[PDB]
Amino acid sequence: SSQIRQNYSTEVEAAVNRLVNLYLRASYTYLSLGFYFDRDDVALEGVCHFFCELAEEKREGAERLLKMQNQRGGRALFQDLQKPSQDEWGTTLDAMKAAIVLEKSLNQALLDLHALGSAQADPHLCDFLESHFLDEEVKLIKKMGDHLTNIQRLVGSQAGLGEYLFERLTLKHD
Amino acid sequence: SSQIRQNYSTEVEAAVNRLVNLYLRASYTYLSLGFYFDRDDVALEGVCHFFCELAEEKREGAERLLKMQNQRGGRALFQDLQKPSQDEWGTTLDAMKAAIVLEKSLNQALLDLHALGSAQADPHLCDFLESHFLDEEVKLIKKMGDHLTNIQRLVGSQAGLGEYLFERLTLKHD
Amino acid sequence: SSQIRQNYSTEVEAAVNRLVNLYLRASYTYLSLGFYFDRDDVALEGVCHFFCELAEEKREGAERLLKMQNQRGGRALFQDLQKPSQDEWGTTLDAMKAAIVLEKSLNQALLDLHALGSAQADPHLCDFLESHFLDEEVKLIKKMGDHLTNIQRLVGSQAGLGEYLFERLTLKHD
Amino acid sequence: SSQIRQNYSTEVEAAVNRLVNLYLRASYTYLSLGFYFDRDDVALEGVCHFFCELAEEKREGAERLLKMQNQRGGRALFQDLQKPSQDEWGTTLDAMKAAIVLEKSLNQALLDLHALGSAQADPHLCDFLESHFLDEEVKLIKKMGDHLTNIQRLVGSQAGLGEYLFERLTLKHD
Amino acid sequence: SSQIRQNYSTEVEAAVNRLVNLYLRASYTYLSLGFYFDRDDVALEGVCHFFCELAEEKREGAERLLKMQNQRGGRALFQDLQKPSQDEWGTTLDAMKAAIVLEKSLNQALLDLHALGSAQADPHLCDFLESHFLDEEVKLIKKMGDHLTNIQRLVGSQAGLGEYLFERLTLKHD
Ligand SMILES: [Mn+2]
Ligand SMILES: [Mn+2]
Ligand SMILES: [Mn+2]
Ligand SMILES: [Mn+2]
Ligand SMILES: [Mn+2]
Ligand SMILES: [Mn+2]
Ligand SMILES: [Mn+2]
Ligand SMILES: [Mn+2]
Ligand SMILES: [Mn+2]
Ligand SMILES: [Mn+2]
């Protein structure tokens, strides 16, 4: 806190707390998506594993931000985690579209914080984001776009067939 | 028998013998299902292996009940095993529906025996069922429901295609 | 969902969703406690590790409940996660007292759900709780009480000394 | 030198030579601190090892800067190393306070050079500092702040007791 | 019994049965002490382990005496085991004082039996005690006295502090 803090604006401190909230909310959305695809009336294991893995990744991103907040001498402040935007997530296509909207929102929040850090002349913040978040997001969004295209090519006139095939042949399962 | 028996009602004893019969009848039904899918005009190896594995599991459940009957001092009594309800089992979908009806009947018989044991203040019986049967049944029924949903999504307009694919890509085979 | 559900009341289904919320809220409280003890002006590593480990344990409990909800054919429903009750947690003694209040509330919710399950004649639910939650809670609460007594014996007239010593000599750290 | 130099201002070149001096002066201060805590009338081995390790780390930082100066085509220029600011360093608390003042001064010099590099549109310089220095400094300052808080909680009415305990139970020794 | 007995007086036989009782009573006292220090409001693990280990050692001494009684042809006779002298044992100091009183009583009973054996010209008895009991008791009493002195030096004005420290730094714990 006040004995270590140096070159760490109140504006960046607050924005880091809001970004933690966003990552934890994304983790919660992925938890919901993963358990939806584990329903016996949905039953797509590879899709469940894909989203449950992302729930863990988004948690870990939040935790890295909170570690950094303490390393800089700021104070972590927590807010409510809003419930996810849907209770039921539709098809794998619907879910993957909602995931890429979610990641684009996270990426925009990263970019906005980076611009704040650069305006504040806070290079540790900017490098932190560049090294641990910006490329993770670009890689994930690319993977999701790759998946979207493949899901879309499989719809055909045979949508259940395509949904099965994608889960079996692209996504990771036992 | 009479030198060891303690807190073991005649009602539970008889109901355990009837539950052994039910499990052995289920094992016999699965034996029939497994060999039906081994017919050269049916020829779904993964489906055969799925049902033949369940025939063994239902036998083993019967044998655990018979061991318990002796551990409590009751007397095993055997009845005829009725032949299975069908000689030919249709499609994998037909078979999986008949399996989930069969397991729901076994699960109801478990629940009914548990309620009898609890009315009789027989906690060893109740715990025996809870520890060795109730969750096995819930897990199996969930797996069957997962399979049902996937089989159903594959029917499409291309039912033979779907049946093949499910057997190849979900069920275990050489 | 409706193809597998058997002996699973709407009352238990809803109560499981509320218990998931409680466990996730407890996990969030522990996340806050852990990062508070990582502040440079608090700086008790063993205390941070103790609470961060509990954040993971409470998450995993929520996830086991959600898996069970799907295994029974119920539908997971998520609500907002309320922020934790404090932003700053005081001394290790204050924190440990707040943790035992939190665990006693979770344990009471487990006991209440167990009584509901027993009134509903749902032995799978009751055994699920007995096997995976009730003794975990009793063991954890006992450990917390052990810690409380040791923290209290260390206050003395030398409270900072005691706080350091407990963290160094009882809690796990690098 | 002139055959390789590209996008490397005279201003950055001179500022790198001054930063080398600062790191070597910090290394010299740590050498003095380490041998002070090795005095038979001070005799805190863990404190000696903590500062002697930092003397090596600050040397290595200077050497990385000098390697970079040559990689860019600048010319290393050396100045006198001023003696450290004290001949005797007081208590572990006094020493740790003087270390965090020293590191905050180094960190400010890093930040100032980074701003110069960014004004000069020298991204290799800026990334060099971000990758090899800025987070090292933030991590070290955080560790020192953690130590300060623990040393301070141990003073109590029993300062010698606290000083011993911290050295024994937090710092690394044989 | 009568086919093997040689040089084994009725007086030694009866005194061995009384000494078995004393060792089993000591084992019972240690069992009580060990579980007292496992209370959540006492919570000294190392103290619990120290007494629980002694409960086992005193049992094993009783069993060695009973084996010897049979080896000599005497007849083991059992009496009631009196409950321990306290239900609650106070501080570690109180407990250690009560343990050394208990061991001094056992040692006096050993010495008295040895004198009986020597009056009876029973060298096998005397050597049995010398080889398997007398030095075990002297070593244990010495260890307890060592502990007593260290517990006493730690009381200071800070008794809870001392009690914690002794448990942590002298006694064996996880
Ligand atoms: Mn799954
Ligand atoms: Mn999942
Ligand atoms: Mn076959
Ligand atoms: Mn077969
Ligand atoms: Mn930590
Ligand atoms: Mn932590
Ligand atoms: Mn040294
Ligand atoms: Mn040194
Ligand atoms: Mn114990
Ligand atoms: Mn014990």
UniProtKB/Swiss-Prot annotation, chains A, B, C, D, E:
Ferritin-like diiron domain sequence ranges: 6-155
Family annotation (InterPro entries): Ferritin, Ferritin-like, Ferritin-like_diiron, Ferritin-like_SF, Ferritin_CS, Ferritin_DPS_dom
Key word Transcription regulation present: no
Entry binding sites for Fe cation: E53, E56, E57, E60, E63
SUPFAM superfamilies: Ferritin-like (SSF47240)
GO terms under cellular component: autolysosome; autophagosome; cytoplasm; cytoplasmic vesicle; ferritin complex
UniProt GO MF annotations: ferric iron binding; ferrous iron binding; iron ion binding
Pfam families: Ferritin
Swiss-Prot/TrEMBL keywords: Acetylation, Cytoplasm, Cytoplasmic vesicle, Iron, Iron storage, Lysosome, Metal-binding
GO biological process, one term: intracellular iron ion homeostasis
Stretch list, region Catalytic site for iron oxidation: 53-60
Places the protein is found: Cytoplasmic vesicle, Autophagosome; Cytoplasm; Autolysosome
Positions carrying N-acetylserine: S1
Keyword Cytoplasm tagged: yes
Family label: Belongs to the ferritin family.
Assembly mode: Oligomer of 24 subunits. There are two types of subunits: L (light) chain and H (heavy) chain. The major chain can be light or heavy, depending on the species and tissue type. The functional molecule forms a roughly spherical shell with a diameter of 12 nm and contains a central cavity into which the insoluble mineral iron core is deposited. Interacts with NCOA4.
Its job: Stores iron in a soluble, non-toxic, readily available form. Important for iron homeostasis. Iron is taken up in the ferrous form and deposited as ferric hydroxides after oxidation. Also plays a role in delivery of iron to cells. Mediates iron uptake in capsule cells of the developing kidney. Delivery to lysosomes by the cargo receptor NCOA4 for autophagic degradation and release or iron.
Matching PANTHER family: FERRITIN, FERRITIN LIGHT CHAIN
Further details from the record: In horse spleen the light chain is the major chain.
Protein name from the UniProt record: Ferritin light chain
Organism for this UniProt entry: Equus caballus
